Every structure is written in structure tokens, then in C-alpha cells.
């Protein structure tokens, strides 16, 4: 069963450079052509580059021509995209995709998808903050001033999953931040303990914010 | 490059009712034309190939119609289980390209919002800082608005708000708005509201606190 796992996303500065890969398996990596197409939230999914089953040719549109250099190592079973002189509009997710053609054709096989951010911001560690109180209860916890995105949120570790609402984060300058809430039954509360995890693997910290009735 | 336009750019429609997708080509495609699924967090999904070829796997209820301009997808009866973003691809000439995308919401019955406030926390107040949060929860349409006022006055600035997508159990949407304002200024001052009209109801629903 095919297999497309790419790796190498990060927070590049603007004008840097930086250099994902793709682990194809489960298939015959040198008869296919393979590609890479990227997905923004305004703009949607489009088109970066391909290469044939060979390397013979490669494919680029023009608003990355010059730049983005798609190469693959048919030992490896591996797939190469090696970008220079980032620009902000290069911010997205980057997927590996195979076509079902040696050379180029529509998309049959899609990757996991890695994120690359092109900023000067620097990374950042969020303040979590319990949302306390002041039927069934509702807390909530509440992470701010971080970057790069993503930050992870959970409930008693993951052992409460149902109420649970996170919403989007949301750029306030060149620092997201975000909430989740909680809704437990009145009776496992204050008598029950409630935490909050908030994980920001970017600046590799963990946090765990118990919500005490104020 | 041949320019693939789709529409409509978001569509909701309820359970069992049909869903009809429709894609326009910059020029003749023949029928080079493909379709993908994308669910949240997920990649995309192929579903239909070139041909209005069904894809393996995929349900009976989709189906690709057209050939040369017009295309278009479309579902027979729209299952809980399809509440996604739908792509289509020309794979006819290069470079390849995509479609604005379509987004499908499940209309449902009307439901309010349950307005929760929140006073900044002891720790934040330390910092040197307030956020007042507020949480709208479950309610639809996604359509709704939440003001800030502090003592009766009104306010706009430093107010985050954010939605959720559409809840995948019972088609709801819940929000989350979230005043921002220094340790200073918030201390001198008592009465704290979030405010939310919502078509659910008349009257604005209002939920407080104060000191
Ligand atoms: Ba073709």
C-alpha cells in the first residue's frame, strides 16, 4: 500500500533556503513521475513541480521556476525539493503527491503534507491561562503570545474528549494565540481536577495548567 | 495556462438533498477532468479521474458529469460522512491546475448560542495584562456577532475573534471571542459584557460580569 511521508518543513527566514524530502514505499518508486504541490488557505492547493520516472525532466510554473529544484534518488526511493531565496507567499504545506504516469498526469497518491513558514518572527513559547468560572460547567484555558504555529491542546491529557472545542489560532502582529474550552457536568467539578496541555513543539515546551476556582 | 473555474465557492445543503458541483474550463478539456475530496486536517482524497471515472473505493452516490467545458460533480444524497472541501483537476495540459474549491456545510435546524464569560486569570493580571474571554457555544448558522461593551460603552479594539469548523457530530459552530486590554486600564473599570446577535433570537443574548 502506497506510502508518500515527507519531512522538512520549519521556519525558514525570507530570502533563505531550505530542503524537504519525500520517503516513498509500497510501490515501485522508478515508475512513476512524483511531485510536490502546495496548499495555502487563501489560494487552495497548487501545482509547485514534478520529475519524470527518471529525472530525465522536470516541470516547474512559472512563480517558482528558478527557484524550487525538484530532484529524486530512484536508490533511496526518495523525493528531494530543494528551495532558495523564500518568500513569504511560499508560506503553505507542502505535500508529496505521485502521479499514475511516468511522467506527469493527475494526482493518485497524496503525503501527510509538512508546513513551512516564511518569517523573521522569532520562535516563542505561549503563556497558557486558565479560563476559570467566577447543568454543566464550562472552563477553558487559554494559550497566547506564541510562534510558529502549531501548539498542541488536550484535556486531562487526552482522557476528556467530549465538549471540547479549539479554535483556530489567529495572528495578532507576528504572535498567534488561542483557546480551547471544556464543558464537564457540574458534579465532577470543582470535586473533579481538571488540567489543560498545551504543548509548543516548536520551542519544545510542554505545559500543564490545572483550572482552580478563582 | 488552461484556467479551471469553480463555483459554487461554499454550498449548504441538508441531509438526503443533492449536491451538484460544477467546474469550467478555460478552454477544452475533453474530459481531462478530476475530482478530489479533502476532509479537515487530511490530505486529499482522489475520487474521480479522468473519464468521469469513479475511482475505486469510492461510494456510488458521487459521480462526475461532463466532457470538453462543463463539469460536474455531484452526490445523490448528502451523508454526514461528506462534509468536505472538493477540488477539481485538469490533468490535460500544463501546468497542472486546480479549482477555487468548494466547501459543503450541513444546514441544519436553528440552534442558540451558549454565551459563557470569563474575568482575566490572577497569573495574566501578573504579567501585566487582561483578556476577557468569551464562549459562544453550539449554536448555526456560523452567521453571528459578539460585541464588547465596558460599562455600558461600547468598545472594538483588541478584540480576537475565532470560529470553529462545523462540528462533526451535531453540525453546530461555536466561537470563541476574546478582549484583549492592559492590567491599567481594565482595573479601572467595572462593568464587563459580551454582547451576541444571532439569528436563533431577537433580542441580543448578553451575559456579564462586573468589578
Ligand atoms: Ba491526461
Known amino acids: 500500500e502506497v506510502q508518500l511521508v515527507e519531512s522538512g518543513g520549519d521556519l525558514v527566514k525570507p530570502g533563505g533556503s531550505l530542503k524537504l524530502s519525500c520517503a516513498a514505499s509500497?510501490?515501485?518508486?522508478?515508475?512513476?513521475?512524483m511531485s510536490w504541490v502546495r496548499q495555502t488557505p487563501d489560494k487552495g492547493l497548487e501545482w509547485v513541480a514534478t520529475?519524470?520516472?527518471?529525472?530525465?525532466?522536470?516541470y516547474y510554473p512559472d512563480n517558482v521556476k528558478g527557484r524550487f529544484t525538484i530532484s529524486r534518488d530512484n536508490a533511496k526511493n526518495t523525493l528531494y525539493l530543494q528551495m532558495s531565496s523564500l518568500k513569504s507567499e511560499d508560506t503553505a504545506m507542502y505535500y508529496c503527491?505521485?502521479?499514475?504516469?511516468?511522467?506527469?498526469?493527475?494526482?493518485?497518491?497524496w503525503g501527510q503534507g509538512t508546513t513551512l513558514t516564511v518569517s523573521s518572527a522569532k520562535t516563542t513559547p505561549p503563556s497558557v491561562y486558565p479560563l476559570a468560572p467566577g447543568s454543566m460547567v464550562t472552563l477553558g484555558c487559554l494559550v497566547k503570545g506564541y510562534f510558529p504555529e502549531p501548539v498542541t491542546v488536550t484535556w486531562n491529557s487526552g482522557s476528556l474528549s467530549s465538549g471540547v472545542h479549539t479554535f483556530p489560532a489567529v495572528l495578532q502582529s507576528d504572535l498567534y494565540t488561542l483557546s480551547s474550552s471544556v464543558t464537564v457536568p457540574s458534579s465532577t467539578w470543582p470535586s473533579e481536577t481538571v488540567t489543560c496541555n498545551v504543548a509548543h513543539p516548536a520551542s519544545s515546551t510542554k505545559v500543564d495548567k490545572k483550572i482552580v476556582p478563582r | 495556462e488552461t484556467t479551471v473555474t469553480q463555483s459554487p465557492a461554499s454550498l449548504s445543503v441538508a441531509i438526503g438533498e443533492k449536491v451538484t458541483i460544477r467546474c469550467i474550463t478555460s478552454?477544452?478539456?475533453?474530459?481531462?477532468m478530476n475530482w478530489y475530496q479533502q476532509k479537515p486536517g487530511e490530505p486529499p482524497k482522489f475520487f474521480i479521474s479522468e473519464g468521469n471515472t469513479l475511482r475505486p473505493g469510492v461510494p456510488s452516490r458521487f459521480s462526475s458529469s461532463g466532457y470538453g467545458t462543463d463539469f460536474v460533480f455531484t452526490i445523490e444524497n448528502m451523508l454526514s460522512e461528506d462534509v468536505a472541501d472538493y477540488y477539481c483537476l485538469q490533468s490535460d495540459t500544463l501546468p497542472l491546475t486546480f479549482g477555487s474549491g468548494t466547501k459543503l456545510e450541513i444546514k441544519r435546524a436553528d440552534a442558540a448560542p451558549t454565551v459563557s464569560i470569563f474575568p482575566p486569570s490572577s497569573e495574566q493580571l501578573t504579567s501585566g495584562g487582561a483578556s476577557v474571554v468569551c464562549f459562544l457555544n453550539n449554536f448555526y448558522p456560523k452567521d453571528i456577532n459578539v460585541k464588547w461593551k465596558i460599562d455600558g460603552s461600547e468598545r472594538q479594539n483588541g478584540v480576537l475573534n475565532s470560529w470553529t469548523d462545523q462540528d462533526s457530530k451535531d453540525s453546530t459552530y461555536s466561537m470563541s471571542s476574546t478582549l484583549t486590554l492592559t492590567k491599567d486600564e481594565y482595573e479601572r473599570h467595572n462593568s464587563y459584557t459580551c454582547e451576541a446577535t444571532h439569528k436563533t433570537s431577537t433580542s441580543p443574548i448578553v451575559k456579564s460580569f462586573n468589578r
Open positions: 503527491a505521485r502521479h499514475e504516469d511516468g511522467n506527469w498526469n493527475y494526482f493518485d497518491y
Open positions: 509500497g510501490f515501485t518508486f522508478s515508475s512513476y513521475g
Open positions: 478552454t477544452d478539456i475533453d474530459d481531462d
Open positions: 520529475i519524470s520516472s527518471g529525472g530525465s525532466y522536470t
